[PDB]
Amino acid sequence: EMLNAFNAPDSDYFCFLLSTRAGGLGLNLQTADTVIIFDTDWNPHQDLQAQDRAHRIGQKNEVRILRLITTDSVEEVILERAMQKLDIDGKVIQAGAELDDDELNDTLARSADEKILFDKIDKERMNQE
Amino acid sequence: EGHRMKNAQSKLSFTISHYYRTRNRLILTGTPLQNNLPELWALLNFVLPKIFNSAKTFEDWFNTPFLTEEETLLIIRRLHKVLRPFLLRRLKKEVEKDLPDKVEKVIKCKLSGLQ
Amino acid sequence: KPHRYRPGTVALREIRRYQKSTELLIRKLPFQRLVREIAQDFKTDLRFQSSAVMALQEASEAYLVGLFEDTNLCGIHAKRVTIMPKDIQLARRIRGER
Amino acid sequence: RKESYAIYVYKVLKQVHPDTGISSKAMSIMNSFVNDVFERIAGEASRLAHYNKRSTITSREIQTAVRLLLPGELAKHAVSEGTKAVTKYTSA
Amino acid sequence: RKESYAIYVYKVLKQVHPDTGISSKAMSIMNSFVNDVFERIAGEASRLAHYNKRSTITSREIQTAVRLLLPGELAKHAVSEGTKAVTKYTSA
Amino acid sequence: AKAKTRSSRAGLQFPVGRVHRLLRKGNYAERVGAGAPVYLAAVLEYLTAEILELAGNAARDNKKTRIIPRHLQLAVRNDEELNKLLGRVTIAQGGVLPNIQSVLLPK
Amino acid sequence: AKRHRKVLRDNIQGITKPAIRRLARRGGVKRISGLIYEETRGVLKVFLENVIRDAVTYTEHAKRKTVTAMDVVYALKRQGRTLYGFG
DNA sequence: TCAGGATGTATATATCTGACACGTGCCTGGAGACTAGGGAGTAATCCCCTTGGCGGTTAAAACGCGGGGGACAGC
DNA sequence: CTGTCCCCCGCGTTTTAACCGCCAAGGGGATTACTCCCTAGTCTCCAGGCACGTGTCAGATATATACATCCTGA
Ligand SMILES: [Mg+2]
């Protein structure tokens, strides 16, 4: 039901929550758009799978992704171990400040227009008292 | 999603060998297995119950991740050569070159007072 | 109306059934959690062999079953067939457990 | 190595009910049974000798320990058996 | 001659209730009390050594034996007292 | 060559030396640690003292100045932990605690 | 619930009403009053506290962190409830 | 519910003894000094087993609910 | 022995957590090597403790006397 609903061009919702272990594989979605990672990955391949769910043959829009890592923490540690694990992929392939809103908006920008939209939002964040 | 096969020790793998008469098998995966190397072997063994001599034979047989060009390129070249007729792999770049961008970016954030 | 057995018929069937069989009667994972919690009150960060837990459960069920046997007997003594807390407490008091 | 009495229990079984086998679970039970009895007898013999201010456990102490451990006729037969075994042993 | 703890029990009594005396029957009871406790602790310490495949009974084994013998507060205080005694003993 | 007993070294009222010998003579183990009999003697003293204290209290309650078996019984049976410790012990001439069930008593 | 699971009950509640009933059936109990279930849990809890306390004491003595089957056996043996089959 | 009385319990006073507290001489068992050697402590490896969580099914637990049988109060 | 009422049991329906399989890290339970120091063994000395007498007073026992306690007519 959900998968068909994701495919529905007039989807009421714009986002959905997925299990890394389950949803990471279970999705054919060329109407996918942006991906946000929270779980982190002890085995980088699962992220590669989850990440690339968003762009399969037929994918029309530019995909953007995010990985939310906390500053000075165990997540950085795990992340770096995952980065080390990626080396084997290279072996196969060859065989054959951080919260600056403007900056964040730049990394998330497709056009300066979105920055402008957020500007209005932050002005609203200010407007709320 | 043969990636799941991973460790031949699993019950899944075990019971598959007990499916007996299956005269022709095929594995689909989006990626090679864990960086240790035995996993790759296990799948290759699973697929073709011939490729073996030790579960961890690759640690010596293709001792590249475990000299420069010599231990790298030549060994992984032969890794390729022996796996050339067993692994089929192409990249989306090679196939299409139509992915809109590199579609990549990570971010970092501070903890709240509570956190 | 649908068939209904006279209350107690089923009870006797269960008694025969459970006395005849030998398997454990308490769900293992619930049992483990109980054990682990209790263990935390003497020392934290303990591990258990899975067989250690099994040893605890074999003993635990043996204990409770024996208790129920004696409890049942007490109820009978008082001309009842329904066991009550009073019978459990008595049985333990007579045994010298309290 | 982890010695046990499994082989001895096994042999005994085959001298009583030659066709009957035994599960490994039952075997471990029998193993712990033997250890239990051994300890009980030895334990009694130990303090028994101690009670008489003696330093050596002999067959006399083991015998008495059996009489002080096993119930009724069971004890009588165990004593009879032990006596016989020792008799033969010392002869040979 | 036959030793006992009569004089030690007596001294302890004098250290608790200086004025209070003690009958010979009460004393014989206390004597057998001490022997009982001694044996229970020593017995547990003994098997602790066996359980760990060791052969020396030290204050660690005895301490544990106390924890495995005395209930609640008796254990807490007995252990505390044992600790202090050994501490002072080896300190001086 | 000034002598000083181990009991006095530990500051205990029990014969540490005797205890040490007993541990060896009772064959509890192959070896007996130097701190063993010390630790043990302290425990023996501790328990002895606590009972005697309670026994003396019982004697005082009965206006006696000498501890008798009855007092020992009262002491042990009243204290919860001592009762548990000596739960399987019959004390000669101790008797039983005063105790009549309310079901037997008049209304 | 959906918004918040709120499913934390208790580990003692892991011993269910029917689990207790089954034990009683093996015991030979024909009929069980409603207060038994709570009383039984209380009794079991105590039983386990005593055995576990002994078992972990042996574990501490041996300077280990994993409680073994033999430690449990020793605990039970200590209390006069010798258990066969676990070495 | 209350006073009288019979019994029983408790309480002060001798008094009397034998059991406990205490002094003394002996002697063997405990302390001191010294030596050997092996048991226990301690470090370094390794790898098997434990733990935490998730996925997915399904027997079982929970829950309501009528109604008859036992618990129980009375006599 | 009798009445009565209440509450536990049988049973259908629905929900849910146990069971099993999987995955990943990793950390304590084992091994071995080495060393050192703690205790068994032994010999010598000496006073702490034990058996034995000996005094004396704490509690047992009479002995007379004052109050609590239980049963009953009122
Ligand atoms: Mg696929």
UniProtKB/Swiss-Prot annotation, chain A:
Bridged cysteine pairs (disulfide): none
Protein origin, superkingdom: Eukaryota
Transmembrane segments annotated in the record for this chain: none
Signal peptide range in chain numbering: none
Coiled-coil residue windows: none
Localization, UniProt: Nucleus
Role, per record: Catalytic component of the chromatin structure-remodeling complex (RSC), which is involved in transcription regulation and nucleosome positioning. RSC is responsible for the transfer of a histone octamer from a nucleosome core particle to naked DNA. The reaction requires ATP and involves an activated RSC-nucleosome intermediate. Remodeling reaction also involves DNA translocation, DNA twist and conformational change.
Family: Belongs to the SNF2/RAD54 helicase family.
Other comments on record: Present with 1990 molecules/cell in log phase SD medium.
Assembly behavior: Interacts directly with SFH1, CSE4, histones H3, H4 and H2B, and via its N-terminus, with RSC8. Interacts with LDB7, NPL6 and RTT102. Component of the two forms of the RSC complex composed of at least either RSC1 or RSC2, and ARP7, ARP9, LDB7, NPL6, RSC3, RSC30, RSC4, RSC58, RSC6, RSC8, RSC9, SFH1, STH1, HTL1 and probably RTT102. The complexes interact with histone and histone variant components of centromeric chromatin.
Protein name as annotated: Nuclear protein STH1/NPS1
Gene that encodes it: STH1
Residue span relative to the full protein: 848 to 1006 of 1359
UniProtKB/Swiss-Prot annotation, chain B:
Source species taxonomy: Eukaryota, Fungi, Dikarya, Ascomycota, Saccharomycotina
Residues spanned by motif DEGH box: 1-3
Name of the protein described by the UniProt record: Nuclear protein STH1/NPS1
Localization annotation: Nucleus
Subunit note: Interacts directly with SFH1, CSE4, histones H3, H4 and H2B, and via its N-terminus, with RSC8. Interacts with LDB7, NPL6 and RTT102. Component of the two forms of the RSC complex composed of at least either RSC1 or RSC2, and ARP7, ARP9, LDB7, NPL6, RSC3, RSC30, RSC4, RSC58, RSC6, RSC8, RSC9, SFH1, STH1, HTL1 and probably RTT102. The complexes interact with histone and histone variant components of centromeric chromatin.
Function: Catalytic component of the chromatin structure-remodeling complex (RSC), which is involved in transcription regulation and nucleosome positioning. RSC is responsible for the transfer of a histone octamer from a nucleosome core particle to naked DNA. The reaction requires ATP and involves an activated RSC-nucleosome intermediate. Remodeling reaction also involves DNA translocation, DNA twist and conformational change.
Phenotype upon changing residue 49 to L: Temperature-sensitive
Domain of life: Eukaryota
Species this chain originates from: Saccharomyces cerevisiae (strain ATCC 204508 / S288c) (Baker's yeast)
Protein family membership: Belongs to the SNF2/RAD54 helicase family.
Gene from which the chain derives: STH1
Anything else known: Present with 1990 molecules/cell in log phase SD medium.
UniProtKB/Swiss-Prot annotation, chain G:
Primary residence: nucleus
Residue positions, PTM Phosphotyrosine: 37, 74
Post-translational modification N6-(2-hydroxyisobutyryl)lysine, affected residues: 2, 17, 30, 45, 63, 65, 77
Organism: Xenopus laevis (African clawed frog)
Residue numbers bearing the N6-methyllysine modification: 6
Positions of modified residues (N6-succinyllysine): 17, 63, 77
Family: Belongs to the histone H4 family.
GO cellular component, as recorded: nucleosome; nucleus
Whole-protein residues included: 16 to 102 of 103
Keyword annotations: Acetylation, Chromosome, Citrullination, DNA-binding, Hydroxylation, Isopeptide bond, Methylation, Nucleosome core, Nucleus, Phosphoprotein, Ubl conjugation
Sequence positions bearing N6-propionyllysine: 2, 17, 30, 63, 65, 77
Subunit-level organization: The nucleosome is a histone octamer containing two molecules each of H2A, H2B, H3 and H4 assembled in one H3-H4 heterotetramer and two H2A-H2B heterodimers. The octamer wraps approximately 147 bp of DNA.
Residues with N6-glutaryllysine modification: 17, 45, 63, 65, 77
PTM annotation (N6-acetyllysine): residues: 2, 17, 45, 65, 77
Protein name: Histone H4
Residue positions where Phosphoserine is found in the record: 33
DNA-binding region: 2-6
